[PDB]
Amino acid sequence: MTDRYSFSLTTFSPSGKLGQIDYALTAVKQGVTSLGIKATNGVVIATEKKSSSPLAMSETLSKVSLLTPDIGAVYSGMGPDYRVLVDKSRKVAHTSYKRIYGEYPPTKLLVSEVAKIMQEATQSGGVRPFGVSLLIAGHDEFNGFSLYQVDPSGSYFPWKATAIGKGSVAAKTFLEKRWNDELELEDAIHIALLTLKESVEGEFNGDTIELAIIGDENPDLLGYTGIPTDKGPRFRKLTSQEINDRLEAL
Amino acid sequence: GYDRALSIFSPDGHIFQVEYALEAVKRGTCAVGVKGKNCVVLGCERRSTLKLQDTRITPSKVSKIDSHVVLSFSGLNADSRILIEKARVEAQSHRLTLEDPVTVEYLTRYVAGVQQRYTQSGGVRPFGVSTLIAGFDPRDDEPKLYQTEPSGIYSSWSAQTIGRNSKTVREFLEKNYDRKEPPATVEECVKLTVRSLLEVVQTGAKNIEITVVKPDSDIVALSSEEINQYVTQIEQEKQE
Amino acid sequence: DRGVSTFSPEGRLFQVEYSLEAIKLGSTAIGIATKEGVVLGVEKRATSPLLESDSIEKIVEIDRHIGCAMSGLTADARSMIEHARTAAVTHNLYYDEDINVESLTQSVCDLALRFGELMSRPFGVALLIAGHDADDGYQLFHAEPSGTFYRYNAKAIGSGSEGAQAELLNEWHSSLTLKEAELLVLKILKQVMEEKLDENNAQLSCITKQDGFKIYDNEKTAELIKELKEKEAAE
Amino acid sequence: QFNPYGDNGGTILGIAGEDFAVLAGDTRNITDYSINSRYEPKVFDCGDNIVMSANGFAADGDALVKRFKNSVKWYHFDHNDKKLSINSAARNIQHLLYGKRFFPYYVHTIIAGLDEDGKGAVYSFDPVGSYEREQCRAGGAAASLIMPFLDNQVNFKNQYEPGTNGKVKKPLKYLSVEEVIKLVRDSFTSATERHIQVGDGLEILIVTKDGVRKEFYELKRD
Amino acid sequence: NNYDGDTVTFSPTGRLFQVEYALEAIKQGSVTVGLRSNTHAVLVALKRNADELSSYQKKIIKCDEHMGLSLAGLAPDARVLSNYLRQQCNYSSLVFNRKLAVERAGHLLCDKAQKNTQSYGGRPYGVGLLIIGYDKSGAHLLEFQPSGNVTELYGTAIGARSQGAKTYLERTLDTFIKIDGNPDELIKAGVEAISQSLRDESLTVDNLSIAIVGKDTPFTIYDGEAVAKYI
Amino acid sequence: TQQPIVTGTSVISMKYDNGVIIAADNLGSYGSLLRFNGVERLIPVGDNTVVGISGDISDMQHIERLLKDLVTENAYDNPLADAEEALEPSYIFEYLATVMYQRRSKMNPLWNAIIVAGVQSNGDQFLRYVNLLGVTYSSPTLATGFGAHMANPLLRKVVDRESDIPKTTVQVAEEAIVNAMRVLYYRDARSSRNFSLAIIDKNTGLTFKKNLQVENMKWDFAKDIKGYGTQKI
Amino acid sequence: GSRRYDSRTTIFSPEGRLYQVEYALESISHAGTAIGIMASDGIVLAAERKVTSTLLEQDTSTEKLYKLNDKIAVAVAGLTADAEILINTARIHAQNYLKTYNEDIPVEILVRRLSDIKQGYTQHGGLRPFGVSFIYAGYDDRYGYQLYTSNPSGNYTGWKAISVGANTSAAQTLLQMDYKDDMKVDDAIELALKTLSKTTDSSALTYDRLEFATIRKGANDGEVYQKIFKPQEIKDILVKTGIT
Amino acid sequence: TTTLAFRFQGGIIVAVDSRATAGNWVASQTVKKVIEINPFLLGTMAGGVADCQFWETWLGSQCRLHELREKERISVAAASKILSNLVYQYKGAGLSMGTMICGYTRKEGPTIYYVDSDGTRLKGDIFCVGSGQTFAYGVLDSNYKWDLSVEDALYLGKRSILAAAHRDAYSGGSVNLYHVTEDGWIYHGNHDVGELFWKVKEEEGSFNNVIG
Ligand SMILES: [Mg+2]
C-alpha cells in the first residue's frame, strides 16, 4: 500500500493553464445556483435545495452551514467536497485561532484558512482540487459585515454581491442593477429571493429554498443567560415558514 | 516521499537528465578562469539584455566560498546558490574539525560530490550548473583552478571556460595560453582573461566582470573603469 | 514509463545492461596479475590540452595492499571507493588484520544491485580491483554494476577492451615478471589509445607485497615508455 | 528493584606454553551459599583451535560465548573459510564486549590457543573489552589466590639463584605441558581449600597444533 | 506485452510475465544437477568462465553444516537468498537448538520469493536454486524457482540444457536412490547426469564443482584437484 | 522491572535410570496469604516434556500460553509433527532460555524459575534449569526456591553424581521426590499439602499424577513439647 | 503502479529548460501587470487588478500588494493563492531573523530565502512549482532602497525599475526610456502609472483596477514608512498625474 | 597510573608506567599504556583502560581514512580533535579518559594534545596524567629544558615515571619509553621498576631514604 502518489496531479500545461483547476471550475459551473448579497446591517446567502428524490428528506441535507456563530457558508458544485470543507473549516477556526486567541476568527482570516486548504489540494501530491466554489458570509467586530468567494484554485475575492454556479452570469447581471450601498438586510433578502427565482425551474418555496443571514445578535439562540458580553450568534438560518412569508411580499 | 528515478540509463548508455543539465550550462552566460604565475583571474559574462538592473544588489557571478577560495558558474542561477551554500557550510565545517581552511581541490571534490549524488538519487534532478572553483591553498603560493559539471566529474585547468560560446573562448585560450610561461603578473593575467571574453562578449562595457584572487586570502573584484582600461588598451593594440 | 528493476524478456535487467554500454564508452583501463605483483594502467584521455592531466585520478588506493582502476562514469566510482576504503579499514579495526581482496571485492559488489524505487540507478563504472593477501597471493578482480565479479589473470575494461583483451589473451603467461607486465600494459594501452601514448596521458601503478600499492611517477613511467619503444624497434 | 546481574562463582585459569596453551576452569556453579551444579562446563571449544571461557555471571558468560562461536561461523561464511587467528578473535571479542559498554557482560573473559607462528597464546579481557596478550592469567573468584602463585612458579618472580644473593635472577626456562598441568591442578586444589565457591571438578582444555584435548579431575565437594 | 512492465500486473490469460522473464534468466544460466539417496544428497554444478584469463564462477554455497544449495541465474540473487537461508538456519540453532528442516527451509524461500512477485517497485529473483540437506528425516533435495514454487525431489536439474540430465535421472531413479552408504558412487551418478547436458565443452578440473551432505558428512564443497577423481 | 504478586513455590526434580521425575505443589500464594489452592504448576508439552514453573503465576500463565502456541506453530506445514519433527525438551528449553535472557536484558523479566524435565528422541534424560536472570544450569537433581536448599540435599543422597543415574529406579526416585515434598511441607511456609507429580519415562511415556497429598506425617511428638525453656505444664 | 500518472514536474527538456517553470512563466504572463520603480528617496509599487467587477469590495480587497514586514513589501503576479503560501513563509522568516539577531532582516536575505524555496520545487519533490513572480520593494541600512524580482525558477535579480506579469516587454521598454538615476519618488509615481496606462489591455486605467504603494523615508526623520494606497488615494494620484 | 609526554628540541618524549588495579588488587603489571595509533602518532592511556584502547585504535582507523582521502599525513591537531569531538558526543554517559595525543609533522613540528573525557582538548609542552601525575610533574618541572639531548630527555621521562611508580601505590610495574621524531616514533624499551629503582638509586645517589 502506502500513498505512492507523492507527485502533483495538477500541473501547468504548455499554454500556462492549470487543467485540473479549470475542470474543477467547470464542475462548479454545472452546480446549482447559489448567491450572496451584502447589506449595510447584514449579509444574506441563498441557494436552491435541489432534491435528488421526493422520497428524500431535503431538510437533512444542509447546503447552508454555520462555520462560526458569526460566519456562514454556501456553495456551488460538488456537495461531498463542500461537506468535508465545512468540517475542516469549522475545526481550523478552533485549532488555528480560537484555542490561541480565545475568540472566533474574523471572516477574512477564516476564508484565508479555507483558501489555504483548497490551494494545497491544487499542489499537494496525489490529490485533485476541490470541485466547489464557496460563498462565505460573516461578521466581526473590527471589519464589520463581509462576503467572500473562494474558488478551487484557493483564490478568494471580497464581494458586495455575487452569484456562482449554474446561472451565475445572468444572476450577477441581475444583482448589479439592484445593489446599492444603502440596502437594509430585508431589502437584500428580497433581492436574493428575486434573483434566485430566475435560476429555479420547478417549485419555489421555503421547502425548496435554503436561505441564511448574518445579521443582528440572537440572544434567544445563545442557549444561556448571565454573561452580558456574550449576546448570541449573528448567523441565522431562515425557517421554511419565514421564507414563505417573504415570498408573499415578492 | 517522492522516490521517482529521474536520472536513469538509456539503451545507448546515456543519462539524458545529466546530459540535458549540460544543455542548461550551454545556455548560461560565459565564465572563464585563467591562472597566472602568482594569481588566478575569474572572468564572467553579464548579458546586456537586462538593463535597468541594479548592479549593487544583483547577485554577483563570482562568489566567495571562503576568504581564500572563490566559485563562479554557468547555467541555472537558482541551482548555483544551493551548491554555493553547501560549499560555504562545508568550508566552515572543515575549519571547525580540521583546524585548517579547505584546499581548493577539497572544496571542488565536495561540490563535485554533491552534483554526482543528485545524478543517482531518487526524486531529484541533476544541477544544471558547471562551476569554476579557484583560489590558493592555506600557506601556499601556487595558483589553483578547477572545473566541475552536472555529472560530478572534476579536474584541474591551466585555463578554462564554461557556458555559452565557451567553445570559441576555449579556442582563443588554447592558442594564447603558454604553459611554460603563464601570465607572470596580475596585469598580464587579467588582460588575457578580458581578451578571451572579448572574443564572445559583445560590448566591453558592463558585460565583463573580473575578479582577481591572489595568495593569502587577497581577493578583489575589479570595477567598471579598471576593466574598461583593459578593454581600451586591447583594441588600440588591435588596430595594427 | 517502466520499472528501474525490470527484467527484459531475455532475463536481463534493462538498467544493468544499459550501464554496461556506458562503461564501453569509458577510457581504457588494463590490469595484469603476475607472481611478482599486479600492474594497473589507465588511459587518462584529457578532453583538452589546457586540462592539467595529473589531476585525472583514474587509479586509486583502497588500502596499502589493495589498489583500484576505473573505467566509465568515473564520478560514480567515488562512493564505491569510499565504501571500499571504509570496508578495508573497518575490517582491520574489527579483526586486527588485512582484509582479503576477494572479501573487499564482494563488499563493493554488494552495493551494485542496491537500486530501485537505496540509489536510483546502477553504477555506470567498472572497476579493476588489484591486491595481495597472504591466503591467495596476488589477485586481480573485475567488479561490474551487475554485482558480479570475476577473478582475472589479465583484464581490460573500457572502450578498447575487446581489442585489448584479445591481445592480453596471447601475451599473458604464468611466468611474467613485474617489468614485463609494466611494458605489456603500456604496449596494449598505446595500441588502443586514440592519442599517442606518453607519461602525461597514461598512468601506471602496481601492488607488491613489500612496498604495497604505488602509483608511478611520470618520470618513472616515461622511462618505461622509452624502454618499450626501443624493445619494439629491436625486432 | 530488579537486579539484572548475578554471581555464579567459579574460577578459570589460562597458561600459555611455548607451543601449546591450556584453559582450565572448575565445574562448580553456585548462587550465594547453594550449589546449582557440580558439573557445569565453563570452558568451551569455539572452533578454529580457540578455547574460551567467560567467568562471572553465567547468563552473560553463556551469551558471549554463544555470540563468539556465532562470529566464528560467520567469519567462515564471509571470508572463504579462512581460519580465525587468535589475535583476530581477541580483537573481535573486544568489539562484542565494548558493544555493551553501558550495560556490560558481567564476565572476565579468557581465550587460549596458538598464534600464527605456532606459539602458545592467552588473551585476557575485562568486562568492557580492554584486552592484552599474556603468558599467564587466572580469572574469577579465586583469581587473587592463584595469580601470586603463578607469578612465583611460572615467571619465577622474587626467585634468585643461590649463592649470588639477589644479584642473579632465576632464569626464565620454558615449561612443558605436563609441568603446566601440575601447576594448574595445584592451583585449583589450593583454591578449593581456601575458597568456598571453588570445588567439585576441574576441567582442562589443552590446545596444540594437533587440536583441542580435554582432561577432567575431581575436586573436593564441600 | 502490455502486461510485462512490472511484476504487479497479471496478463489477460492470468500470467505474470516478469516472473516468467526471471524464470528465463535461469535457463540462460549454466547447468547444475541435484540428486539423493537415503543416506546422502549430492549437488553437481558446471561452472562457467568469462574467458580463458578469467576464473570459473562459483555455483555452490554452504548454508549450514547440514545444508547448502547450487545456483543457476543471477549470482547476486543467489547470494541474497543463500544469506537469508544462513540466517534462518542460524536462528533455528541459536533460539531452538534445532537444525532447520530442509522442507521448512524450502517454505521460507518460497515465501521470500513470493513477496517480490505481488508488490510494486520490486522485482522477482532472477535465480533458480537446488537445495540439498540432511536433517532428522534423512536426506533431501529441493528445487527452488523464483516464482515461489519449491519442490521436493529425488533428483533434478536446472539451467541451460538441463532437460538431458533430468531425463537421465528420471531413468536412473530406481538405481541412484538405492546408493546408500557410498558417497563416491552417488557423486558418479550425478557427474554422469550432468554429462548429459554438456555440448562442445567437457568436464575439466576447474570447470566441475561438486558438493555432498549425508548421515555422517557435513556439507562440503569439492573444487579443483579434489574433483579430478571424478573426471 | 516489577515485583511478583501471585507466586508459586518450589519445583523439584531428579533424573533416574530411564527418565526424569518432576514435582510441584498446587498453591498460588498472595504474599503470606495462601490464596489459590488449585494451581497446576507442571505444564506438559507433548508426550515427552514437562515444564515446571515457580515464581510469578501471571508470568507462568503467559509462558504456558507461549508453550501452547509453540506446539501449534510446530505443527504448521510439518507432516512429522507427531514423529521426527516433534518438539524436543531441548528445543522447548532453549526457546524459554532465550526468552528469559532477552526479557532480563530489556530490564523486564519474567519473574520465574523454570525446570524443563523430559526425555529426548534418543532416550536421553533432559533436565535443565532457567530463571528470571536467564541463568541456566543442569544437574542430576534440580530444584527451585526452598527446594534448592532442602530437596536437593535429600535428592543428592540418591543421585550424588552422573554415574548414580543408571543405578536409580523409578520407585526409588519417586519415593525420594515424595519424601522431599513432605519435608518442604513441614518447613516451607508458602507450601501446600496438595501437589502434582510427573514422570517422563523413555519406555512408559508421560505419567501425570494429579491431586497427590503429603502423607505419613510425624506430628505426635508435638504433645510432649511444652513452653520455651523452663515451663513444665 | 502510481508511476503511470506522474507528470514529472522536475525534469529538463532536451534543450535544458525546466518544462513546468517555463509553463508557469507563461501563466504569469497573463496576470495583471505589476511595476516597481526605485528612486533615490523611495520606491514605488504599482499594479493592475485583473478584470474586476463593480460589485467587488475593493477597499477590503488585496490581490497584488502585500506587506512582508514594516520595511519590505511585495507585488504579486500569478496565482494569488500560491503567492499567499509564500508570503506567510516570508513573514515568518523575517520574524525569525528579527528574533535571532534583534535587527530587521536585510532585503536580499529575505528575497534569497523565498527564491530558494521556489528553486526547491523545481529540483525535488515531484510537485508543481509556484506560479508566482514577485517584485520585492524594501529598505535596510546597508543598501538602502532596493528592488528585486523572483520567478518560479527561484532566480532573483536586482532592479532600478522593473515590471512583471502581462506586457512586461512593452512595459520594460517604456521604463528604460524615461527612467533616470537622479529620479525622485513623485516622478517615479508618475512614470509607473503612465507605463501601466499604456500597457494595459483595459480600455482605460481607473482607480478600481489598481493597487498602489510607496516605501518612503518620507517618514518623520531617519526611518521608513510603507503606504498601501486606499481606493480614494489611488483615485487622487490618478488625477494628480493627469491620467483621469 | 602515571603517563607523561613533553616537547623538546629532539621532538617528544613519551613515558608511561604499566600497572593496572581493581581497588587494592593489582590486576596487571604489564599494561601497554601507549597506543601506537599509527607509525607517526602516539596516544597515552589513563582512566578507563577499555575506553582508551577502543577509541584510540578507532582513532587510528579515522587517521588512516583521512590520509587515504586527502593523500597527506593527518595533523596532530586534526587527529586529537577527532578523538575529542567523539568523546564529547559521549559526555555524561560515563566514559573515563585522560590522554596525550603525541605527534611530529612538518607544518606543526612536535605537538602534544591533552584530550579528556569531559571534552577538554589542550595543546602544550609538558603533560602528566594519572594517579601519580603530581610526582612525575615534580621531577619534570625542576629538570626540563628545551635544549635537552635525546639521551637526557629519555632519562628524564624514565626517572619521572620512577618517581611516581615509587610513591604512587596505583602506579608501577615497568616503564615504557618512546621518542617521537618527524619520521615516526621510536620505541626505547620496557624497563622493570623493581630493577630500575636499585639501578637509579646507586648511580644517581637518590632515594637515600630507602635502604638498599
Ligand atoms: Mg570448596
**Cell numbers given for D215:** 582432561
Chain B touches chain C, with at least 3 Cβ pairs below 8 Å, answer yes
**A155 with G131: CB under 8 angstroms?**
no
Q: Could you tell me which residues are beta bridge partners of residue E67?
A: E64, E133
Which sequence spans correspond to the domains of chain A?
1-250
Domains and CATH numbers, chain G: 1-244 (3.60.20.10)
Domains and CATH numbers, chain H: 1-212 (3.60.20.10)
CA dihedral (B81, B86, B89, B94) positive or negative? negative
Main-chain phi, psi angles of G33, to 5 degrees: -65, 135
Q: By C-alpha distance, which of A62, A150, A74, A136 is closest to A105?
A: A136
Compute the distance between CA of residue B144 and CA of residue B132 in angstroms, rounded to an integer.
10
**Which of C25, C56, C75 has the CB atom closest to B116's CB atom?**
C75
**Which of G27, G60, G128 has the CB atom closest to A8's CB atom?**
G128
Compute the distance between CA of residue C140 and CA of residue C50 in angstroms, rounded to an integer.
34
Amino acid sitting at position H171: S
**C172 with C38: CB under 8 angstroms?**
no
| Contacts of residue G159, Cβ cutoff 8 Å, sequence gap at least 6 | B52, B53, B54, G36, G38, G147, G148, G149
Domains and CATH numbers, chain F: 1-233 (3.60.20.10)
Residue with cell 573436593: D220
Residue with cell 500541473: A11
Q: By C-alpha distance, which of E132, E129, E106, E128 is closest to E42?
A: E132
**Which of C95, C102, C135 has the CB atom closest to D91's CB atom?**
C95
Compute the distance between CA of residue B11 and CA of residue B195 in angstroms, rounded to an integer.
43
Task: Tell me how many domains chain E contains.
Answer: 1
Q: Which F residues 131-170 touch D at CB under 8 Å? A: 133-139, 148-149, 152, 161-162
Q: By C-alpha distance, which of C182, C227, C179 is closest to C202?
A: C182
**Cell numbers given for D53:** 571461557
- What string of DSSP letters covers F105-143? HTT----EEEEEEEE-TTS-EEEEEEETT--EEE-SEEE
What residues in G contact E120, CB-CB < 8 Å?
1-2
Q: Report in angstroms the alpha-carbon separations of G183 from C27, G44, G191.
A: 61, 12, 10
- The whole domain housing E17 covers 1-231
What residues in G contact C1, CB-CB < 8 Å?
3
- Closest chain D residue to the Cα of F108, Cα to Cα: D2
Compute the distance between CA of residue E149 and CA of residue E137 in angstroms, rounded to an integer.
22
Chain D touches chain B, with at least 3 Cβ pairs below 8 Å, answer no
**∠ Cα D147 D151 D154 (to 5°):** 110
Query: How do C202-208 and C37-43 pair as beta strands?
Result: antiparallel
Q: By C-alpha distance, which of A158, A72, A36, A161 is closest to A108?
A: A158
G92: left (phi > 0), else alpha (psi -120 to 50), else beta? alpha
Compute the distance between CA of residue B97 and CA of residue H62 in angstroms, rounded to an integer.
13
CATH number for E113:
3.60.20.10
**C126 with C144: CB under 8 angstroms?**
yes
Q: Which residues of F are designated catalytic?
A: 1
Shortest CA gap E65–chain D (Å): 10
Compute the distance between CA of residue D16 and CA of residue G17 in angstroms, rounded to an integer.
74
Q: Clarify whether H120 is annotated catalytic.
A: no
Q: By C-alpha distance, which of C75, C68, C74, C73 is closest to C18?
A: C73
Compute the distance between CA of residue G180 and CA of residue G171 in angstroms, rounded to an integer.
16
Main-chain phi, psi angles of A34, to 5 degrees: -125, 160
Q: Per the CB < 8 Å rule, is D82 touching C102? A: no
What angle in degrees, to the nearest 10, is found between the helix axes of F89-105 and F57-75? Answer: 130
Compute the distance between CA of residue D71 and CA of residue D52 in angstroms, rounded to an integer.
13
| Contacts of residue B218, Cβ cutoff 8 Å, sequence gap at least 6 | none
3-class secondary structure, B240: coil
Please write down the HEC assignment for all residues of chain H: CCEEEEEECCEEEEEECCCEEECCEEEECCCCCEECCCCCEEEECCECHHHHHHHHHHHHHHHHHHHHHHCCCCCHHHHHHHHHHHHHHCCCCCCCEEEEEEEEECCCEEEEEEEECCCCEEEECEEEECCCHHHHHHHHHHHCCCCCCHHHHHHHHHHHHHHHHHHCCCCCCEEEEEEEECCEEEEEEEEEHHHHHHHHHHHHCCCCCCCC
Say whether residue A126 is in contact with chain B using an 8 A CB cutoff. Answer: no
Q: By C-alpha distance, which of A130, A141, A133 is closest to A159?
A: A133
- CB half-sphere exposure, C135, CA atoms < 13 A: 14
Q: Per the CB < 8 Å rule, is H75 touching B106? A: no
Touching subunits of D (3+ CB pairs, under 8 Å) are C, E, F, H
Longest dimension (CA), chain E: 54
Q: Which long-range contacts (CB under 8 A, 24 or more apart) does H64-73 make?
A: H64/C89, H64/C92, H64/H38, H65/C85, H65/C86, H65/C89, H68/C61, H68/C62, H68/C63, H68/C85, H68/C89, H69/C82, H69/C85, H70/B106, H73/H40, H73/H105, H73/H106
> How many other C-beta atoms can be found within 10 angstroms of the C-beta atom of residue G219?
13
Touching subunits of G (3+ CB pairs, under 8 Å) are A, B, C, E
Exposure string for G130-151, b = 16+ CB within 10 A, e = fewer: bbbbbbbbbbbeeebbbbbbbb
What residues in G contact B16, CB-CB < 8 Å?
14
> How many other C-beta atoms can be found within 10 angstroms of the C-beta atom of residue D170?
13
What strand order describes the sheet that includes C137-143?
Answer: C59-63, C66-72, C125-133, C137-143, C149-152
Main-chain phi, psi angles of H157, to 5 degrees: -65, -40
- What string of DSSP letters covers chain C? ---TTPBPTTS-BHHHHHHHHHHHHSPPEEEEEETTEEEEEEE---SSTTB-GGG---EEEEETTEEEEEEESGGGHHHHHHHHHHHHHHHHHHHSSPPPHHHHHHHHHHHHT-B---BSS--SEEEEEEEEETTTEEEEEEE-TTS-EEEESEEEESTTHHHHHHHHHHH--TT--HHHHHHHHHHHHHHH-SSPP-TTTEEEEEEETTTEEEEPPHHHHHHHHHHHHHHHHT-
**F35 with F65: CB under 8 angstroms?**
no
Main-chain phi, psi angles of A101, to 5 degrees: -100, -5
**A50 with A32: CB under 8 angstroms?**
yes
CA dihedral (C6, C8, C13, C19) positive or negative? negative
What residues in C contact H69, CB-CB < 8 Å?
82, 85
| Contacts of residue D27, Cβ cutoff 8 Å, sequence gap at least 6 | D37, D38, D39, D40, D41, D42, D200, D201, D202, D203
**H68 with C84: CB under 8 angstroms?**
no
CA dihedral (D35, D39, D45, D51) positive or negative? positive
Compute the distance between CA of residue E121 and CA of residue E137 in angstroms, rounded to an integer.
39
Task: Tell me how many domains chain C contains.
Answer: 1
**A10 with A146: CB under 8 angstroms?**
no
The residue count of chain C comes to 235
Catalytic option among H1, H2, H44, H111: H1
Touching subunits of E (3+ CB pairs, under 8 Å) are C, D, F, G
Q: Which of E81, E90, E221 is the best mutation test for D, with the most CBs of D within 10 A?
A: E90
> How many other C-beta atoms can be found within 10 angstroms of the C-beta atom of residue F219?
7
Q: Report in angstroms the alpha-carbon separations of H195 from D24, H189, H202.
A: 33, 14, 11
- The whole domain housing C169 covers 1-235
Q: Per the CB < 8 Å rule, is H49 touching D94? A: no
- CB half-sphere exposure, D119, CA atoms < 13 A: 10
- Closest chain E residue to the Cα of C12, Cα to Cα: E25
Q: Which CATH architecture has domain D1-222?
A: 4-Layer Sandwich (3.60)
Q: Indicate the helix (H) or strand (E) that contains F96.
A: helix F89-105
Q: Per the CB < 8 Å rule, is C85 touching H65? A: yes
Amino acid sitting at position C217: D
Q: Indicate the helix (H) or strand (E) that contains E71.
A: strand E67-73
3-class secondary structure, E90: helix
**Cell numbers given for A60:** 437533512
Exposure string for B94-104, b = 16+ CB within 10 A, e = fewer: beeebeebbbb
- Closest chain B residue to the Cα of G161, Cα to Cα: B52
Q: Which of G124, G141, G150 is the best mutation test for B, with the most CBs of B within 10 A?
A: G124
Main-chain phi, psi angles of H162, to 5 degrees: -60, -45
**D91 with D63: CB under 8 angstroms?**
no
Specify the experimental method. Answer: X-ray
Main-chain phi, psi angles of E8, to 5 degrees: -75, 0
Q: Report in angstroms the alpha-carbon separations of G169 from A15, A17, F219, G47, G175.
A: 18, 21, 117, 16, 10
Residue with cell 487588478: G49
**G52 with G211: CB under 8 angstroms?**
no
Q: Per the CB < 8 Å rule, is C10 touching E28? A: yes
Compute the distance between CA of residue F38 and CA of residue F26 in angstroms, rounded to an integer.
5
Q: Could you tell me which residues are beta bridge partners of residue G77?
A: G133
Residue A17 burial by Cβ neighbours in a 10 Å radius (0-12, 13-18, 19+): middle
What angle in degrees, to the nearest 10, is found between the helix axes of A79-93 and A107-123? Answer: 130
Chain D touches chain A, with at least 3 Cβ pairs below 8 Å, answer no
Q: Per the CB < 8 Å rule, is D77 touching E62? A: yes
**F185 with F214: CB under 8 angstroms?**
yes
Say whether residue D80 is in contact with chain E using an 8 A CB cutoff. Answer: no
> How many other C-beta atoms can be found within 10 angstroms of the C-beta atom of residue F3?
8
**G231 with G208: CB under 8 angstroms?**
yes
Say whether residue H86 is in contact with chain B using an 8 A CB cutoff. Answer: no
User: How far from each other are the two terminal CA atoms of chain B, in whole angstroms?
Assistant: 65
Compute the distance between CA of residue F85 and CA of residue F71 in angstroms, rounded to an integer.
11
Q: Per the CB < 8 Å rule, is D102 touching H49? A: no
**Which of B4, B113, B177 has the CB atom closest to C117's CB atom?**
B4
Say whether residue G11 is in contact with chain A using an 8 A CB cutoff. Answer: no
Touching subunits of C (3+ CB pairs, under 8 Å) are B, D, E, G, H
| Contacts of residue D34, Cβ cutoff 8 Å, sequence gap at least 6 | F148, F149, F152
Q: Which of H62, H74, H81, H121 is the best mutation test for B, with the most CBs of B within 10 A?
A: H81
- The whole domain housing B44 covers 1-240
Exposure string for B107-117, b = 16+ CB within 10 A, e = fewer: bbbbbbbbbbb
| Contacts of residue D149, Cβ cutoff 8 Å, sequence gap at least 6 | D183, D187, D190
Compute the distance between CA of residue F210 and CA of residue F198 in angstroms, rounded to an integer.
9
Q: Which of C93, C94, C149 is the best mutation test for D, with the most CBs of D within 10 A?
A: C94
- What string of DSSP letters covers G122-138? HHBSSPPPP-EEEEEEE
**Cell numbers given for E42:** 549430492
**Cell numbers given for G34:** 505589476
Compute the distance between CA of residue A82 and CA of residue A117 in angstroms, rounded to an integer.
12
**∠ Cα B21 G133 G240 (to 5°):** 150
**B31 with B163: CB under 8 angstroms?**
yes
Say whether residue D96 is in contact with chain C using an 8 A CB cutoff. Answer: no
Q: What is the gyration radius of the CA atoms in chain G, in angstroms?
A: 18
Compute the distance between CA of residue D89 and CA of residue C95 in angstroms, rounded to an integer.
7
What angle in degrees, to the nearest 10, is found between the helix axes of H150-167 and H193-204? Answer: 110
Q: Which CATH architecture has domain A1-250?
A: 4-Layer Sandwich (3.60)
Compute the distance between CA of residue C94 and CA of residue C88 in angstroms, rounded to an integer.
10
| Contacts of residue A15, Cβ cutoff 8 Å, sequence gap at least 6 | G23, G26
Shortest CA gap D158–chain H (Å): 10
